[PDB]
Amino acid sequence: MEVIELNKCTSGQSFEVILKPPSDPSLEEIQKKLEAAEERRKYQEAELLKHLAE
Amino acid sequence: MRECISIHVGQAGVQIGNACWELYCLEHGIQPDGQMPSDKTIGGGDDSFNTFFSETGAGKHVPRAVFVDLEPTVIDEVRTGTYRQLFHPEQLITGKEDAANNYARGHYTIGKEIIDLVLDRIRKLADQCTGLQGFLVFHSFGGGTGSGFTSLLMERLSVDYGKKSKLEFSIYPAPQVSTAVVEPYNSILTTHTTLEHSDCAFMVDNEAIYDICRRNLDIERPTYTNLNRLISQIVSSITASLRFDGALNVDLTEFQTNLVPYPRIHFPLATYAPVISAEKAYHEQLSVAEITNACFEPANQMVKCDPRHGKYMACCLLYRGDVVPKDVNAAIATIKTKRSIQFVDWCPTGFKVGINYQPPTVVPGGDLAKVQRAVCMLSNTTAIAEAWARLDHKFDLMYAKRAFVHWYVGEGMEEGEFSEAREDMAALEKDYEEVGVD
Amino acid sequence: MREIVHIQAGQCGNQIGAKFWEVISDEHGIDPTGSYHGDSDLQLERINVYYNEATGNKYVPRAILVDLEPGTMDSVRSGPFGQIFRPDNFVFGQSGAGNNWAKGHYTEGAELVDSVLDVVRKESESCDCLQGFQLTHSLGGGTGSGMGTLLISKIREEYPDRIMNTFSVMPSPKVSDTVVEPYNATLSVHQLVENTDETYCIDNEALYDICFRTLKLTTPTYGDLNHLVSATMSGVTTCLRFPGQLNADLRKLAVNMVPFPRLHFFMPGFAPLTSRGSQQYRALTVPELTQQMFDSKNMMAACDPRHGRYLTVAAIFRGRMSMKEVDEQMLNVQNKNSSYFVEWIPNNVKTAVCDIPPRGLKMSATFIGNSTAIQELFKRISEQFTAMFRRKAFLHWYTGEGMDEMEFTEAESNMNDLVSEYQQYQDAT
Amino acid sequence: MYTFVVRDENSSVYAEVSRLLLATGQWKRLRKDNPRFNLMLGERNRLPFGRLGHEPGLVQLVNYYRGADKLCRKASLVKLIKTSPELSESCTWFPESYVAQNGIRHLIREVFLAAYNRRRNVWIAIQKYLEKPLLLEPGHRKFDIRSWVLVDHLYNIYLYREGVLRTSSEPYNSANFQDKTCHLTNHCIQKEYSKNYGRYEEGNEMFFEEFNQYLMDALNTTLENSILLQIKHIIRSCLMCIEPAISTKHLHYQSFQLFGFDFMVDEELKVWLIEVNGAPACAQKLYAELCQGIVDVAISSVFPLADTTSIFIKLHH
Ligand SMILES: Nc1nc2c(ncn2[C@@H]2O[C@H](COP(=O)(O)OP(=O)(O)OP(=O)(O)O)[C@@H](O)[C@H]2O)c(=O)[nH]1
Ligand SMILES: Nc1nc2c(ncn2[C@@H]2O[C@H](COP(=O)(O)OP(=O)(O)O)[C@@H](O)[C@H]2O)c(=O)[nH]1
Ligand SMILES: COc1cc(C(=O)c2c(C)oc3c(O)c(OC)ccc23)cc(OC)c1OC
Ligand SMILES: [Ca+2]
Ligand SMILES: [Mg+2]
Ligand SMILES: [Mg+2]
């Protein structure tokens, strides 16, 4: 068990103690997914209005 | 000096953001009007507190922060509350109608309409930075906005700010003090979409905070105010290395280096020092050994789980108060003899210690007592996967009947996004078993 | 203050609606003149939900009163709070509907419907952020049944993204005006299944039995029935009218209570059951409120919850009370009776507390259950339906208005379809 | 009213504990996947400990200790004894072990050969390292001792005062290792291969009264002093060793568990530890008494009944 990398300053200290050793989509793609959902939404809205039409 | 922008999304993120920035102002001696008499360099500077505060010519220190909610009530309380003058009005962004506890509505129908404006107000802050580090994003797993909009914001931040770090402070849903039945859905959806865009995420299980307030603060029914003041104490400990002079976790990238050896396993467990009631008429001050040993008690963790049945990949001890290295090492030697602390073998069994001499700060008229020394332990342990198992089970119980799924499909989501999200969670749980179980 | 637009239709609709406005106006401190003379800011902080802030510092209900005959609506104007309403919002025909769903939906009601939409649209124009609509009506009559559902259909067309909420009084031969009530109810349920987000099933059978078996009222009037309805409508709207920790609204109610779009018919229940005359002075303990509110004798739909299981539950407590006790008592009931709650919806009981009690009580609790046991009500209606439809009895009343037998067969089978969906989840594990 | 669920339909002892709890009128059994229980009689494999202790308003207890598998699996028990300093390389009561019948060489690893190569005998892979087993000369037969141990939520170690002796039926021969019967006293191999199962005692199970009486008549000693003292030590040692790893003292859920310890008594009255079984069956005569002890000690202690000695021996610390 040994202390390593001891740094001191007026605010405090920090060190490391080692006990034992070891053994994205595009803006084009984000826009596509967001608009594919608006079309899926506007379609279901159109199904409702055409159904209310009958 | 490399600046950090905080983003607070949804109710939980906004109200936790308030409690954090209130704490930050007290720790740095900044008044509610934004002035800081201790700051003798006026109009600017590259001090460590400037990581979180820019300075105006009038001597005013304003948070590098953006508050966004799809609904005005909560952020309206910011614009009128104690810290009106602290924030530029353009940093407090509200919609007109919230996501109705629905990820799909927060991410698609309502969020798509406000994403462009938020990004621009976010960019207005980035253009004030000489060397932007990255973002700290506060949100709930369960809320429609905190889950749906956050994931939408995380994607666009990755394209616009490709080289900047992004850390999360995430509220994990607890039935004890939750809001919605569909919070398991929102949690799984937002976690799946955000996983590949977040560099480090500190999860806070509302059940842990709630019981810590019940047990250690003797508060019968903790309020959000009670919870948020405690969370900010933990958050302040984690971010203190960014706002004060120190050698450990000085920049956001070092959080990843020290805490996250694998990018997907980026959920460190936080355990906090002593939580003592201000109302307690006589208290005995806990030694360095007593508070360091307390870091390995599940009763003090932000997420209830058993680290004895997992493996550590990293451990950080963040001290605040009267603490010297001699006492820390003596306490670690004592603890290792009596506790089940086992690391993955491709990692050295060792603790990274940071000490700030200033004892923790407490809000006047709060619930926490003033303490002479404290510590926040950040350990990356596979034991936190218990939380994923807990959540994924509740998801499975509802999805087997496709219960409530029509509310999401009705806003444009496909049923396949649900199963696509759950499969990523199943893969996340398998990764944790690979690293942690023999 | 996401605003709600209120609509009452028909004799039942307006008489129950009038009592609702009486109760909440007293709660919010609004006298019949329209001005506020109360003591607390909490009464006004969310007044915009149900009231427009009219010129001259007065509050006007955002309510539209609709009927195909002038009788019941003239008596509302004569009533204690009839002044409170806006006169342009009275929309009436003169020929009546003769307890005929066809007259309300296809003929007589069709002359008058656009006149009503013009008023609904005027009220929605001045709304900053409309939640949606709440309608009060019966299903056994002609106007509120036939035209109320036709209104619902037309409002969904013009406001497809707003919430549609109804208080629907179900007919019972124990409080029967007419034999054709099962026809009118079955046709209207078909409408409510399609075009409603949330319906409170107020069963006149349950209302009668509570007055008879519990309040010891030997001969109960529609007045005694409407006293129970008014107290329930005040209870279920508590979270909309008063500041809470939830910031509840109609959409979040539907999101959390309705796991399957068609299964949106709620069983309501109320605090201690109280008669208009009896002012009893012992306040209830929180265990009593909880025990009573889950009791079948306190349900407003004649169904036994022990014959089904709860998909979702919403409970609202009113008065000054330890919310630790409330939490302990509610967890007690779920843990003690977990067999009557579905296990595949975790945390399916939500409770909210409001510190201001209703008038005349210091403790109160309102119950909103989405139980598969509501299928008992629907198949009771359809049994009465089929008993006379297999003989095509009294159909001429409807075929003389243009309807076909085919439309009856379709409404019948869709309501039988409704019953099968409640059944599949009561046995699902 | 209390609440419990069953998730191991093949457990003989918890099927009995189920019958008793229901027969108190104060316990009700829910369907297995109902999360609103007080008591979980869980699976023996992949029990979800991570889902226990998160139900508001419920104290949750389970009949298994998470991590007790490190004592109840053959491979991990060897690595546990050799690695725990509390037990050591030099553990006088565990047969020398490095990592199915017995013989000499040829398997069926470096360090194994050297110890076997330090000989100027018999091995197994009821163990047969001890070619000097200790004879029951009213037949000249071998046995094994099974003591059932209950550890409650407070980590008291309760040793049931009734133990069983599963015996071999025919004489022991020092050169009959392919003949597995005369010196492998597993009960299932004793009902199939054996020659006269049931002559000397019923079901090849001699209880402690008859056995202690035999020790007095035949060797002028007692079961308490010559054997049980050593047994009490081995049980106390193993369970105290792993207590920091498995104790639920400061947890959001509680654990108890009933273990079965298999012992081997050599000819010089020295006790050897064979195996620890985490899901053990029980002798038929003793079922009613022991399962009543589980309820009084492990279940009713956490969930008390209404107001209206001991079958265990507490092993202290
Ligand atoms: N710790 C903490 N948790 C909170 C707070 N506010 C809400 N939550 C949790 O957040 C979840 C609900 O999400 P919210 O943040 O309230 O919802 P939202 O982000 O505003 O999104 P909307 O659905 O559109 O309102 C629940 O699990 C709550 O327990 C808070 O102030 N502190
Ligand atoms: N609870 C209650 N039910 C009523 C009231 N008035 C009528 N009903 C019921 O409603 C049905 C008659 O409908 P009604 O409202 O008179 O028809 P409409 O005027 O054509 O819309 C019957 O089942 C009555 O029992 C009332 O004031 N209260
Ligand atoms: C409109 O009237 C109400 C709305 C809400 C609500 O908006 C819910 C919110 C915000 O979360 C929930 C929830 O989680 C539920 O679970 C069953 C049920 C309802 C909700 C809750 C209510 O009572 C508890 C109401 O009745 C007065
Ligand atoms: Ca400066
Ligand atoms: Mg919100
Ligand atoms: Mg009538």
TrEMBL record, chain C:
InterPro entries: Beta-tubulin_BS, Beta_tubulin, Tub_FtsZ_C, Tubulin, Tubulin/FtsZ-like_C, Tubulin/FtsZ_2-layer-sand-dom, Tubulin/FtsZ_GTPase_sf, Tubulin_C. Keywords: Cytoplasm, Cytoskeleton, GTP-binding, Isopeptide bond, Magnesium, Metal-binding, Methylation, Microtubule, Nucleotide-binding, Ubl conjugation. GTP binds at residues 11-12, 97-99, 138, 141-144, 176, 181, 204, 222, 226. Dimer of alpha and beta chains. A typical microtubule is a hollow water-filled tube with an outer diameter of 25 nm and an inner diameter of 15 nM. Alpha-beta heterodimers associate head-to-tail to form protofilaments running lengthwise along the microtubule wall with the beta-tubulin subunit facing the microtubule plus end conferring a structural polarity. Microtubules usually have 13 protofilaments but different protofilament numbers can be found in some organisms and specialized cells. Belongs to the tubulin family. It comes from Sus scrofa. It is found in: Cytoplasm, Cytoskeleton. Its cofactor is Mg(2+). This is Tubulin beta chain.
